Amino acid sequence: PDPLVKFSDVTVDLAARVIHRGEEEVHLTPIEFRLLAVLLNNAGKVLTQRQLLNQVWGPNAVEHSHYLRIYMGHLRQKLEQDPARPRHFITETGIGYRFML
């Protein structure tokens, strides 16, 4: 299963909770990391906003859909070449999100 995930200039050790780009250490927030993980562990699958709020928080569903948008933004800001044009952290409009690689 291998807890060492690599996608662009980013390498993420899921076990240690550490991330390098590309590479020196990018520092994530504990919340931003549980979301990265969930996303990394569902690579390529399209996940609903409720699915994501469930897996990151649990009773923070669903009346807290905005936190998910705010933390996707943070993830893009830190990990994406162009936060405005994500290549890995992809939105499925009206549904949820999809992570590539």
Numbering used by the authors: 5 to 105
Lines from the paper:
Synthesis of hetero-oligomeric KdpFABC, a P-type ATPase, is controlled by a widely distributed TCS consisting of the transmembrane histidine kinase KdpD and its cognate RR, KdpE. Phosphorylated KdpE (KdpE∼P) interacts as a cis-acting element in the promoter region, resulting in transcription of the kdpFABC operon. The interactions of the DBD of KdpE (KdpEDBD) with DNA are most likely mediated by a wHTH motif. Focusing on the DNA binding domain, this study describes the comprehensive characterization of interactions between KdpEDBD and its recognition site (kdpFABCBS) by: identifying the two 6 bp direct DNA repeats; determining the X-ray structure of KdpEDBD and identifying residues involved in DNA binding by mutagenesis; and quantitative analysis of DNA protein interactions by analytical ultracentrifugation establishing equal affinity binding to half-sites with no detectable cooperativity within the limits of the data.
To determine the structure of KdpEDBD, X-ray diffraction data was collected up to 2.5 Å resolution. The KdpEDBD structure was solved by molecular replacement method and refined to an R-work of 23.6% and R-free of 28.4%. Overall, the structure of KdpDDBD resembles that of other members of the OmpR/PhoB family of proteins: It has a central three-helix core (α6-α7-α8) bookended by two β-sheets containing four and two strands at the N- and C-termini, respectively. The C-terminal pair of anti-parallel β-strands (β11–β12) that form a β-hairpin structure constitutes the wing of the wHTH motif. The 15-residue-long, solvent exposed helix α8 of KdpE contains five positively charged residues that can potentially interact with DNA. Likewise, the α-helical and β-stand elements of KdpEDBD superpose well onto PhoB in DNA bound conformation with deviations restricted to loops connecting α7-α8 and α8 to the β-hairpin structure (the DNA corresponds to the PhoB recognition sequence). In the superposed structure, the steric clashes between DNA backbone and Y191 of KdpE indicates that the α8 recognition helix may have a different tilt angle with respect to the major groove to accommodate the larger side chain of KdpE Y191 (as compared to T194 of PhoB). The corresponding residue in KdpE is the β-branched residue T217, the branch point sits close to the peptide backbone, which makes it unlikely to penetrate the minor groove formed by T-rich sequences between the S1 and S2 half-sites of kdpFABCBS. Mutant KdpEDBD were incapable of binding to DNA in EMSA, even at a 1∶8 molar ratio of DNA to protein, which underscores the importance of these residues in stabilizing DNA-protein interactions.
